[PDB]
């Protein structure tokens, strides 16, 4: 029968016997509580299961029921503005049903609300027309921000629309489409399930060429990311990997946000559920809660370690689903090192040979497969649409050491490296980005964007990188021999770099003027700082005393420093007064 | 009621099939339907009874960790009885004002607890949707914490200390002076777990609870350094299940401290090594983040219950190394850390809290307009900026002398001396209000000219810089 028996239990790993005829990565209900687990290995009639719940109390001989299906995610209306339990079940509905502050073991709750009536409106397809996977055969109004949630045929479905529902209010369970393929008729509702471990197909993978404009000056200017790119944020335990993630979730260009908390605090998923509704986005033309377009995949550290893996699959699959609707999604995975620890904990309890630091030999392959799901792509099916999935993965190196297996693998895979510095985070220098080691490999492509919007941007960025590197090399000398032994040019370089660090690179993410910094403001500030450096270098090059000139031009320096304080609210060309009130008041 | 199901007798199987004993672990061979995480009672040949937890099951084989140690256990006359349940603690509100073993047995010469319930010591992870984000600031009385590392009621913030350092005195002062900045309209209940501590450490905490009348509000779980090591793996969960019962089941605001949580890591490594598992850094278990997060994350507030758990684990960093696995994984799980510093302590300062490595993750939201004061965040950030610059001015003066450090560096040296010796320095039993501490911070930032207080916005720099 479908019932195997538990043979061995150790941590999250349950080995079940009588499991002959079991498929890899098949979901199983373990025990009498029907805990959800996935068959990870098959050895004869013995199937090894990673249980996604607490295994405490599991007995040898307990039933294990095959489900015949993989770990799947439900995709459809009712997915934004919601928070999920690592696996695809909803936490708010769980609380409402169990009427308790805990998550009951083995509770079953449909992922998408099946009582909400969605205002379906059919698309461009009619009866007798051919439909294939990815074809938007309708749209429902989900919320004021996501005003048209595309209803796509499942990626692996096909046939001739035998029947298409009219415009009206339908629940998720009501039939919406009938499609005949080889005489067999299939029924499609407003939602469909997709294996979270299979990447969703696309027509072709494009080249990411548009910037992922965060609100951060250092990340936008020095180490830019693109829409569809992969970035990692390694850092110690208080340098701001989660504040960067949340600021990006708040102010990024992305049409949708998939915020995955893989083994993180439950007060950091609670703050996102508290602030994102109170934070709004005018990307739709009117202020709509950023939460209206931002969904969550809360799986804290007290929560099963094996569901830290199902948390990262769910998030990337949701981003791929929303990219398949023409949207530019951003999956923010905080943290990727907690998913690697979960695979190190499963592998260790699973018996196979450990790698460098106990991790499995296939950790790199798993990370590569996860990051290969990000990118810009043309969506399968018509109407022709293009979407992108960016991945921002926070890595948490053991002790802050970037030589770790997970950090090394991610740096091998990802194209942007926003390495954080603990020393800078202690001075409250935020974002605490290590400009010495951080790199962006998207600067080359972004050339086009800059040539179309800010031609000086790459040159100014390179100049600021050069100044910062010189000052890094020079402050070490000054710490030992004193500032008065330097050349006036070197002292100008040090002063300029200090000003840049304390006024351009440092950005209070929890204020009104520096919670967000648009690219035009970043470019203007960059021009101001570089122009100040050029003015000082010329004044000293043709003969002057920098020591006195600093006092003489103290107020010009003050104005350049205070450029930080301009409120972005007075958008574009009111702040752009600094083009003359700063670059003509001096320099 | 639910308690009515307790009127049931469930006979237990007594096995006498022990096949191995190595370290904490006893292997028992012919179990009938072994149950994971189940608690068993080992009767020794001597006749004494010990308790153990089933760490792994495989067919008829079970691996049990004995909390009280495996000394005196033999394979012939030692019997093991399987209870069929996990480890449950009896909980009543009469636990408050009592002292227990690390296993939860009374040591105050009082009777056992007349239970109102038997609550599994592993609890259950709180629904992240049911959680409230803590925002009620607690005046610890200590300016180094209230003004720069402000703790919110419901926060989990340990004390990263080392050996020879006054982290017990700091924690006692916090428990003694803790209270809301704006009272809602009552004293915290306290749950104190001690793992592998000295006898004089436990005596200090107990007598300081005596002195302040907070012992009637206190349950102590004392696993001393002369008690079994493995029993330390249950002490913090028995104490967090008692704290939880007061916090949600009785709706009691509670402050629960897991003293020497760093010692619990040693017991977790001992058990893991006995099991020959694949180790992490320094030999510690690869699952130590998941084992320390099942203790640290049992703190916070929940929506409909008017109670909270504020957790202050105390953690001694080996060799003062913050990159050591224990402090490292605590930092990645906890919402801040009060860093007790040996350089400040040797320098005569108390509390020797170095605010630079310290952090409060819930301070941003706990401070500001209408709830502490408007200058609290800007003042704190400016104090961090000026302290980080005074400590680098003092390194340049150590190698180069004053004659080659700028005027701003001299101002920062002056700021550093008064910060550490007048603001961070503070007597025990000296309770400063978050407002006195902000006034003293303003007095120390006036050392500088209004123009170099560049981390304060002009609005705040205008009202408070000139008073």
């Amino acid at each position: 029968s479908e019932y195997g028996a538990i043979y061995s239990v150790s941590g999250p790993v349950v080995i079940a016997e009588n499991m002959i005829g079991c498929a890899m990565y098949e979901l199983v209900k373990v025990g009498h509580d029907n805990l959800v687990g996935e068959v990870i290995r098959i050895d004869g009639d013995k199937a090894t299961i990673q249980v996604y719940e607490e295994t405490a109390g599991l007995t040898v001989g307990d039933p294990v029921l095959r489900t015949g299906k993989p770990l799947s995610v439900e995709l459809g209306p009712g997915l934004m503005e919601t928070i999920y339990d690592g696996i695809q079940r909803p936490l708010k509905a769980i609380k409402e049903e169990s009427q308790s502050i805990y998550i009951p073991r083995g509770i079953d709750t449909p992922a998408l609300d099946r009582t909400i009536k969605w205002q379906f409106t059919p698309g461009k397809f009619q009866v007798g027309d051919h439909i294939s996977g990815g074809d938007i055969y309708g749209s429902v109004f989900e919320n004021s921000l996501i005003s048209s949630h595309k209803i796509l045929l499942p990626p692996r479905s096909r046939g001739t629309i035998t029947w298409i529902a009219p415009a009206g209010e339908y629940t998720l369970d009501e039939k919406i489409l009938e499609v005949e393929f080889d005489g067999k008729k299939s029924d499609f509702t407003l939602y469909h399930t997709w294996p979270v471990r299979v990447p969703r197909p696309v027509t072709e993978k494009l080249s990411a060429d548009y910037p992922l404009l965060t609100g951060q000056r250092v990340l936008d200017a020095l180490f830019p990311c693109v829409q569809g790119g992969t970035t990692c944020i390694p850092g110690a335990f208080g340098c701001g990997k989660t504040v960067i993630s949340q600021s990006l979730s708040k102010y990024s260009n992305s049409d949708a946000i998939i915020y995955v908390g893989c083994g993180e605090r439950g007060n950091e998923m609670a703050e996102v559920l508290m602030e994102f509704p109170e934070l709004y986005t005018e990307m739709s033309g009117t202020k709509e809660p950023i939460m209206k377009r931002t969904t969550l995949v809360a799986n804290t550290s007290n929560m099963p370690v094996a569901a830290r893996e199902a948390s990262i699959y769910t998030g990337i699959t949701l981003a791929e689903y929303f990219r398949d609707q023409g949207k530019n999604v951003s999956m923010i995975a905080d943290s990727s090192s907690r998913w690697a620890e979960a695979l190190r904990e499963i592998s260790g309890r699973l018996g196979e040979m450990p790698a460098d630091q106990g991790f499995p030999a296939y950790l790199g392959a798993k990370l590569a497969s996860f990051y290969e799901r990000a990118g810009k792509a043309v969506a399968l099916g018509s109407p022709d649409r293009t979407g992108s999935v960016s991945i921002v993965a926070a890595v948490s190196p053991a002790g802050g050491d970037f030589s770790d297996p997970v950090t090394t693998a991610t740096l091998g895979i990802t194209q942007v490296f926003w390495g954080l510095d603990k020393k800078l985070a202690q001075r409250k220098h935020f974002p605490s980005i290590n400009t010495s080691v951080s790199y962006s490999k998207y600067t080359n492509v972004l050339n086009k964007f800059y040539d179309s919007n800010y031609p000086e941007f790459p040159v100014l960025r390179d100049r600021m990188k050069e100044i910062l590197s010189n000052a890094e090399e020079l402050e070490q000398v000054v710490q030992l021999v004193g500032k008065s032994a330097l050349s006036d040019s070197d002292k100008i370089t040090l002063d300029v770099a200090t000003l840049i660090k304390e006024d351009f690179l440092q950005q209070n993410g929890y204020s009104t003027y520096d919670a967000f910094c648009p690219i035009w403001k970043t470019f203007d500030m960059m021009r101001a700082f570089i122009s100040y450096h050029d003015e000082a270098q010329k004044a000293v090059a043709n003969g002057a005393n920098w020591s006195k000139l600093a006092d003489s031009t103290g107020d010009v320096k003050h104005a350049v420093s205070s450029s930080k304080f301009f409120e972005p609210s007075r958008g574009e060309k009111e702040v752009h007064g600094e083009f003359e009130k700063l670059l003509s008041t001096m320099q | 009621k639910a308690v009515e199901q307790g009127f049931n007798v469930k006979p237990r199987l007594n096995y006498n099939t022990v096949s191995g004993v190595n370290g904490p672990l006893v292997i028992l061979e012919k179990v009938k339907f072994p149950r994971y995480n189940e608690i068993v009672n080992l009767t020794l040949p001597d006749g004494t009874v010990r308790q153990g937890q089933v760490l792994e099951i495989r067919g008829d084989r079970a691996i049990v960790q004995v909390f009280e140690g495996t000394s005196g256990i033999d394979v012939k006359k030692t019997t093991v009885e399987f209870t069929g349940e996990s480890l449950r603690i009896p909980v009543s509100e009469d636990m408050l004002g009592r002292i227990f073993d690390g296993s939860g047995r009374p040591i105050d010469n009082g009777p056992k607890v007349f239970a109102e319930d038997y609550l599994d010591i592993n609890g259950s992870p709180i629904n992240p949707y049911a959680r409230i984000y803590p925002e009620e600031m607690i005046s610890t009385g200590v300016s180094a914490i209230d003004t720069m590392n402000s703790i919110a009621r419901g926060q989990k913030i340990p004390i990263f200390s080392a050996s020879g350092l006054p982290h017990n005195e700091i924690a006692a002062q916090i428990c003694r002076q803790a209270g809301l900045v704006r009272p809602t309209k009552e004293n915290f209940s306290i749950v104190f777990a001690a793992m592998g501590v000295n006898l004089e450490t436990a005596r200090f905490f107990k007598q300081d609870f005596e002195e302040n009348g907070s012992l009637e509000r206190t349950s102590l779980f004392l696993n001393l350094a002369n008690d079994p090591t493995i029993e330390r793996i249950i002490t913090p969960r028995l104490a967090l299940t008692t704290a939880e019962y007061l916090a949600y089941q009785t709706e009691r605001h509670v402050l629960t401290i897991l003293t020497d949580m760093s010692s619990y890591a040693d017991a977790l490594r001992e058990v893991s090594a006995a099991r020959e598992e694949v180790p992490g850094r320094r030999g510690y278990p690869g699952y130590m983040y998941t084992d320390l997060s099942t203790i640290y994350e049992r703190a916070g507030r929940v929506e409909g219950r008017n109670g909270s758990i504020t957790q202050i684990p105390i953690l001694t960093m080996p060799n003062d190394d913050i990159t050591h696995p224990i402090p490292d994984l605590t930092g990645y799980i906890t919402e801040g850390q009060i860093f007790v510093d040996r350089q400040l302590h040797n320098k005569g300062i108390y509390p020797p809290i170095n605010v630079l490595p310290s952090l409060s993750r819930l301070m941003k939201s706990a401070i500001g307009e209408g709830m502490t004061r408007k200058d609290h965040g800007d003042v704190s950030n400016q104090l961090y900026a000026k302290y980080a610059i005074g400590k680098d001015a003092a390194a340049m003066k150590a190698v180069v002398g004053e004659e080659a450090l700028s005027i701003e560096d001299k101002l920062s040296l002056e700021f550093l001396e008064k910060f550490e010796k007048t603001f961070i320095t503070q007597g025990a039993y000296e309770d400063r209000t978050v407002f006195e501490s902000l006034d003293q911070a303003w007095s120390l930032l006036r050392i500088y000219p209004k123009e170099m207080l560049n981390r304060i916005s002009p609005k705040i720099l205008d009202e408070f810089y000139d008073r």
Binding site: M353, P354, G358 | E276, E277, V278
Partner: peptide, 10 residues
């Protein structure tokens, strides 16, 4: 660890 696993549990 690797030698123990391979030569005892494999």
């Amino acid at each position: 660890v690797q030698e123990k696993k391979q030569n005892e549990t494999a």
